């Protein structure tokens with residue numbers, strides 16, 4: 670019963686993106702996508718151990734979460750960030766669907782060298798749509814650490830330097846049932862940069878053991 674997308678039977682990712690809109694968007698709109706998954710054969714597995722030291726350790730790190738299970742809820746998403754896009758609006762949008770009606774809690778731990786640097790925790794109540802429940806965390810403003818990290822990481826003079834920094838930069842995303850405390854989706858994000866004739870791109874893996 671192996672997964673084909675980033676999701677389980679209980680909770681599926683529908684869309685995610687991190688983006689920026691220039692000031693001139695209020696005239697002629699446009700947004701620039703740093704990264705962007707869109708899910709409108711089984712994925713390739715990656716042993717979770719090979720990424721242990723890239724994430725937190727005591728309580729809420731990769732291993733201690735994988736030991737609570739469910740193992741099938743764990744995914745690795747490798748990003749190629751488009752970093753070729755100044756005083757504009759930086760944002761993140763997430764969307765999930767479910768068959769059952771829950772109140773999600775959604776944690777975004779940003780880690781530098783595996784140290785938890787910045788965390789955001791949100792909750793979202795289900796809204797019933799076409800026979801199914803829908804969870805919408807659209808346009809959350811990026812935390813100022815991420816915005817600043819990006820202007821710095823944009824001004825670096827070489828891509829290989831960019832990917833060197835980014836090798837110590839990861840994000841853990843943990844969605845759990847707020848009521849029952851059980852885990853529904855855990856997604857480790859590792860990052861590189863994209864030779865921006867190509868925009869963003871991504872690979873989704875099942876974390877296994």
Ligand SMILES: CCOC(=O)/C=C/c1c[nH]c2ccc(OCc3ccccc3)cc12
Nearest residue numbers: 687703704750761777789809810811812840
């Ligand atoms: C909404 C409040 O918290 C935040 O600000 C962000 C939370 C995130 C949760 N999962 C993510 C996946 C990627 C990402 O940024 C992409 C990105 C990173 C590095 C270089 C280039 C691009 C942000 C998040």
